[PDB]
């Protein structure tokens with residue numbers, strides 16, 4: 001499951017630490033961090049490139065180092081896709097810290113970004129040049145579904161799909177990622193204490209109750225991600241304490257109301273992703289086809 005059998009090809013991925021100029025932090029948890037860096041010649045010969053470097057911080061143990069190595073292997077296993085954050089290289093040599101180097105995405109995470117554009121949105125479109133529109137939102141949804149369809153094809157599951165784990169790069173390209181240990185999950189209100197600190201508002205009933213993670217529970221989370229996108233970055237389940245009674249109502253069939261910027265069809269898609277039976281939710285392949293059609297109709 002963590003790719004401990006498949007090897008690391010150093011000649012392909014290894015990047016020298018002394019060609020990496022580390023800069024300002026991009027995100028910090030308790031044990032992990034992401035740092036902005038300039039990398040000389042990491043992918044194009046003798047060309048300086050801005051990159052994002054995931055690494056441990058002081059306080060990390062070897063257990064987190066093992067987790068970071070497994071993350072490097074998972075990214076190598078998954079391979080390249082436009083809508084998955086692109087692995088560029090790694091620093092794995094002894095005598096320095098493990099570093100996982102990925103592409104830098106200009107606009108950061110999608111939640112924060114959308115939350116800043118409420119005053120820069122029109123449903124259908126020079127004064128409006130940098131505005132989001134309904135087309136951008138369906139387009140972002142489409143791209144995340146394509147990315148997840150790809151992940152499913154590599155026999156992977158995300159386990160933490162949410163707008164905070166989507167990056168927005170140039171030209172309206174979104175990329176799925178996992179900040180993981182580079183997010184302070186104690187101080188982040190999206191992760192609630194259960195037994196573990198877990199993203200309960202994004203989790204399917206079977207995951208909350210039976211600790212079952214499959215690609216179909218990722219579909220549930222994708223539905224919540226849609227809600228985040230068509231609320232322009234609102235926090236899910238507004239006005240609700242996330243306690244025992246929330247978990248019961250969810251099981252009983254309670255669901256979020258339509259968000260402010262949704263279409264009727266998009267809301268029905270959120271409801272489809274939140275079907276109580278995992279097998280009756282759409283697949284990511286069906287989500288791709290469906291969102292592609294909605295993009296046409298738009």
Ligand SMILES: CNC(=O)c1cc(Oc2ccc(NC(=O)Nc3ccc(Cl)c(C(F)(F)F)c3)cc2)ccn1
Nearest residue numbers: 026034052054085103104105106108176177178179
């Ligand atoms: C302003 N710009 C930034 O702040 C910024 C910050 C970045 O920080 C990041 C750096 C590295 C990562 N690492 C992953 O994502 N690891 C990963 C592990 C398992 C799995 Cl399954 C996946 C997958 F496949 F889901 F994608 C991805 C995540 C975010 C990157 C770009 N830009």
